[PDB]
Symmetry: C2
Subunit: 169 residues, 2 copies
Amino acid sequence: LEVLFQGPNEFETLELEHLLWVNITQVKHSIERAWTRELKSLNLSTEKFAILHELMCLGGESTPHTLARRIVFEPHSVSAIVSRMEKDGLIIKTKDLDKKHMVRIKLSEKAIDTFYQALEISNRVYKQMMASITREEKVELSKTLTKLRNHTLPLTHKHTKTLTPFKYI
Amino acid sequence: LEVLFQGPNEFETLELEHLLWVNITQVKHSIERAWTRELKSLNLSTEKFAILHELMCLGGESTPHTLARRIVFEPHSVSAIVSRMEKDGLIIKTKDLDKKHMVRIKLSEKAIDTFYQALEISNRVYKQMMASITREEKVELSKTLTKLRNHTLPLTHKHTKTLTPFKYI
Ligand SMILES: Oc1ccc(Cl)cc1Cl
Ligand SMILES: Oc1ccc(Cl)cc1Cl
């Protein structure tokens, strides 16, 4: 005999758009926790891997402002992450010879070799994580998420980002 | 005349599963930045709103271990967020009368009234953010993201979570 007055209340039924935000949050946390443990032996968080990857796309050297433009994160966050990486020996900062006050940021050989290793592990980890959804589901998920990013990024980022135009296939 | 040797390199073409992780990350950051600015006048981060919401589903009072079980975040994070909320006057912690060392956590009247306000603003914000995708796209996005959460959460959370079974419609 089911007990009375103990079933879910009205706050467990959400607008679909709110449930989508819960879903996005839960998958981002679930996948990050699993990937971060597999990458532990290289001491990479997801943000340090993202910054290594963007600098690889830039030919291994750039400036803080160009890297910030290319990546979704806030610039103060980009700067904090780069400073952590500098202390890990992954990034070398040098004074630009021309512009007083401008910094150039360059990946070390150690960091490029770490990225070698981390990209191969990372690709295996994302594939095994997403093996439960089909190619077509993956294709439509990227299209829908891309529509959402294109609609929402300009609400707070007004010409400040020119995100790296990643391709697949 | 297009300059030579300056086009994207091979690190800009990703495995689809890696591009999906970039997409998830970018939408989570884009939507959070926009929602957090609209909710500023109530001094809520997304995590404090999530904890207020889960405690509302629990009838406004619970214990740290039950709240942790119901929410995706790590328990040390849940605890840090609850302590911040206690300092904001949103949560009252009391010693359980029976169990030595057990804490009960209860929302204050101020917090329930804040949640009133925040839920109504939040629902408007998520709707306007997601107005670019159709009902059917929203429905399929929740189904795909739910498959991904169900496959990936058990890789690191082994019977430690019993996430709140949110419904829509
Ligand atoms: O590889 C990446 C580049 C950028 C971002 Cl935001 C995430 C990842 Cl994994
Ligand atoms: O309302 C919520 C409940 C849980 C989580 Cl993880 C996110 C939100 Cl918005």
